[PDB]
Symmetry: D2
Subunit: 390 residues, 4 copies
């Protein structure tokens, strides 16, 4: 039970909460889904504010006492101590303002608490003046995303490389086994089961390439572009220092865009990643369809392979064994195709020097990378490893 001042009025924020009115206002405007932005987003949002204060202090804009406690409060956010304080819906108006401010206020209050000051006391440490210094919504939020995306994206590469490998092991394990090769679902010449499995592993290889390639256009950021991208009084030293600090703490080869308007209004580095992810899920779905057909039977199917039993067999009907792990892979592809349509749509919704539709674009981008990682990690383990011939 507390009090905080907003232009709309005053909301009763709990004494526990590190978020303020600016976040509670977003709870009323956007009670759309209920979800919470991905933990890797929050981490990257923390990396951005820490990177900011470190740079702000170094150029003489931020008071070295107040900032020192913003850095420490930001490091706590990087480590995920405060994921229950980020309560704004991923789908939201204002083009990320609410997500940016939810970071600003949580780090603002927690920085006051460490230095022995009250929560909500914004005369001491303001979430706008001190935490959001030398930065807009339109560069913190993007850059955080760029970082969140890349990091998730690297996790996806490894988990996908590991999957690709385990297709090749199963490729040679069935080099000898011989099945009927089929075109138009209609019997052709006999074919080695191992060839089919190499065929899968070569396209997964080909995706891994495409996905990894989509990172390079994510390394260019616009931190310091501020409101539009002309700079609008944005110090060249601040840009350079916070860029280099963002590259350290995040760990990606991050840069500064050669045109900060271009990096602020265009959203093509995202459609690009989502496009590579769609084509990967096109392929895995086909393969998932193959696996389900080859596993068909026992008596009225193809009975070429046997998948690990991962769900209990029919009550009294014998031989009933559903291929649930491929099935779930088909469904994640259906999300990713959709996700990509929403992303395409939100990208087209660009107008002039900003695209205010980023929240849903980034929600679906992150979700795409996340569900793929997980199904690949669950599929390979509880299916690809155990797959045996008949």
């Amino acid at each position: 039970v507390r009090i905080e001042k907003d232009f709309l009025g005053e909301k009763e924020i709990p004494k526990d909460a590190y978020y303020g009115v600016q976040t509670i206002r977003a709870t009323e405007n956007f009670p759309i889904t209920g979800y919470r932005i991905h933990p890797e987003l929050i981490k990257s949002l923390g990396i951005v504010k820490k990177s900011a204060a470190l740079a702000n202090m170094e150029v003489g804009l931020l008071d070295k006492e107040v900032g020192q406690y913003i850095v420490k409060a930001a490091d706590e956010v990087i480590e995920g101590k405060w994921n229950d304080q980020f309560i704004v819906d991923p789908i939201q108006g204002g083009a990320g303002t609410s997500i940016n401010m939810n970071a600003n206020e949580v780090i603002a209050n927690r920085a006051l608490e460490l230095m022995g000051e009250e929560k909500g006391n914004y005369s001491k440490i303001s979430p706008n003046s001190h935490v959001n210094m030398s930065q807009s919504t339109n560069d913190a939020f993007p850059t955080a995303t760029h970082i969140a995306v890349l990091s998730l994206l690297n996790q996806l590469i490894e988990t996908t490389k590991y999957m690709q490998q385990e297709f090749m092991k199963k490729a040679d394990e069935f080099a000898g086994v011989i099945k009927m090769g089929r075109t138009h679902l209609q019997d052709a010449v006999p074919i080695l089961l191992g060839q089919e499995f190499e065929a899968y592993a070569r396209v997964i290889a080909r995706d891994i390439e495409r996905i990894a390639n989509t990172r390079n256009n994510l390394y260019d950021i616009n931190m310091g572009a501020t409101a539009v991208g002309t700079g609008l009084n944005a110090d060249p030293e601040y840009i350079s220092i916070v860029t280099e600090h963002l590259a350290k703490f995040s760990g990606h080869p991050l840069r500064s865009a050669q045109h900060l308007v271009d990096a602020t209004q265009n959203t093509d580095c995202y459609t690009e990643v989502s496009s590579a992810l769609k084509v990967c899920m096109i392929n895995m779905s086909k393969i998932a369809n193959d696996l389900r057909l080859m596993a068909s039977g026992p008596r009225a199917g193809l009975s070429e392979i046997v998948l690990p039993a991962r769900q209990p067999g029919s009550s009294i009907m014998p031989g009933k064994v559903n291929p649930v792990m491929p099935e779930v892979m088909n469904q994640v592809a259906f999300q990713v195709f959709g996700n990509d349509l929403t992303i395409t749509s939100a990208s087209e919704a660009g107008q002039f020097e900003l695209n205010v539709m980023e929240p849903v674009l980034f929600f679906n981008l992150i979700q795409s990378i996340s569900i793929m990682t997980n199904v690949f990690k669950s599929f390979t383990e509880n299916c690809l490893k155990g797959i045996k011939a008949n």
Copy 2:
């Protein structure tokens, strides 16, 4: 901590939890999203287990002493006491079995506790023999979904009607106000702002009608069709009783499907809805786009209307979030189409991702129409 027995091995289910091995096995197979199924779906999933019990007691196949406590503990799930217990991922394999079984176990062990029995004792109360009696995955699950859809869907009709109304009032409020009508974004002739608003309000009317028509096909359910549709030993009396029970406890004019095979493999009743939803969000995204352009300025835009300030910079956040829900929906609909296309023979195993989105759409549309009418439409003014 506890121990329960499954064909893979012996997992450790917390004693606080009412879910069993089947749910925790789902947790390892499908840690896809981390989401939970919608409360109204669980309620609906609880309206089916009650209707299933009452009928099997009415035809004598269920022990009336055990079934008595299956019913009452089901009603607890219908009133949302045990929403924490449903912990399977909406996107999942096995065409919904992990959701259905999650109800069976949570209902089973809470039934046990209400007749003073040990949790986990499936010799006393078996989730698959007792709770899942006369019913397969492929009718319990769909029928719950039908009910959960029609129910959620009714809140949307209402919330959209209200929204439609508040547009009609704004069309009256701007009946005299004059603005420049535009085609190709080029100046045409002046028209009345009220007309634009009535144009909007008339399509929202046309939408409400389109949405509402997609309920008809959704009333036809397949409870008692079991796994395929032929029935597989299915007692005709059971079907009749349980359907009538489901019509009472749901609140919808439900019917039993004429062709129980057709009601089990086809999934057009779901793509039909997504289409009515998509089309609504095509109309609303446009309108929102129109509203943002009208609110543009103050010095270098069109400056035709003034939206209530909701959030510090002032930006038109409410029409914006309308646009973004619209994009969500078109994408949800692509997913729903695919999942429906992927169908094979007597069962479309992709229903969970379809039923996850169809529900999501309905839910997020509802929620934004609410917020938008309230924190925007109502307070709109001319400049």
Copy 3:
């Protein structure tokens, strides 16, 4: 080789051609697809102007001698005589202006040739002044399309009905044929093949139902809404009489829209049609995929049905006969899904009192309706009828 005066310059119109400089400019602006607008649209686009002439004379705007020839010259276009003279791209800017002016020039110039005058001389008969009188692009063009769609939509209903019977015939023909009913592509409970074909029949019923209902919202036309919807000099006696002829000569129960601003700026009736078409071709694509699975083999398949062989693809492997007819269905399915996405994007693109993306919309809506009528026709005639149990 002729000559005509446009604001850009002078182009040489062949003497054989009944179009003019307005059309040729559009041919130079939009060399995009190279396609021609669908004949039923050319037919319907003439029914519009014929009515517009009839009415404009009846209320005292057009000259009774000149309009006499516009009407008789429009009667020819309705019967298809000048399809060669509609050369403007279906994809075109100007919200369908060039399609409108193609009809106005085609008719005007033909009108002049009947009443012993020269083609090109618009002083006696103008496309803009006489043929396009009491109408802008934004009522003549949609109303044509409305009439086109409905006619092409009537054919699908009949062709889909006929198909739907022949599905039922086969489901009576397979009332006894036992086979394995499958779930998750696994074996379950033995079923009858007629029970499947009845399920195919019964959805296709539900498709015919859904598609039928889309017509209602199409019967509201916006003729006489002219430029915006306020009327802008719209004589109420013209609107009533023009609608009458339109409804009469077209066969449809066409109404007049209660709100001329609504019918001119909203496009939901199209997106409504489209989505019904998408749902239909989902079902069919599934029906296809099943058919092909049933028709697999001979020795490494399911071999549940034998489709009539309609072609050879057996140069490499002699004797192999594939399920081509279901295969083409799946493909026309995949078009309609795409077509639908365009129509969605196009609709959402509407700004204020006119939607300038209508042409690409209608191009896709008409194509969908046509390619469905066609492949349904050929699929029933060259596969469904001769299906036989194994």
Copy 4:
């Protein structure tokens, strides 16, 4: 009128036609669209048959006298002599069998006409055995498509580089023109109009970049894979000698696939290209809308630019000039978005060692390429170049 003998019956092919009974059977099975396959594909289909002959003569599998007349026949096809004789529908079952056989028959009956023989007499030159020797539908048809796409892609890149150029030119032209930079359609800071036309210029560069990288995976062909990908009597000399002939005449750095089984059944080269295309049209549509907003006016708009007039002022609203050329871009944009969804569905359809849905995939992929190149062409020439500030 001619007589040719088929399984179904005996069709009456006109004597002046070069297509045979396989082609007319495809005309009756798939009367879907009426479109003809794109001329570059026709041409690319020819380059395939020439290189198939030349190699077959080099290893002595085909008769040198016959092959001589097959080569001369194909070379005429490559210059577009017989584009009229390719009457088959681009959407069709049999995984492209008809499109292949229509080449085989057009080429053979032309070859036979050159050497004095009668058309239809397949004893001398059999389209099936000779013209199509050592090559299946499943490598003849795609390798052509690869070549077709790669030829058509090299065009888009020029037309897009030349477009990007003219953006940069206007970007310098407006360097000192000041306008209001807007976020959320609300006023932000004043900005230079030239800075916007450089954000445009640059994204279009990043598009040229992505687009060109889709060419690599396209240079791997599968020629010699025949039916399944395991060769099936695929003479290693023939393979290599075919590849080099293809790379020669096409003018592409062509390679033989390391794994012909993978190459035959995976279809992710095309989805990768379509993915790029879409992203380009997202970026271009965004730009196209800005241009429509900037040119809005004259008295109740933004009036930031004037686009050259490309169509006459309206009949009802004298001197009203719409942004037609940017409108057609938006529409072609919307095409691709949907064409991609088709392509996506098509690839997904894939089952085992062949994707039978390639026909509607390549139709869309090629269209997207062609229609983009065409709207880019007319847009830079009839809009972007004459763009003037207010």
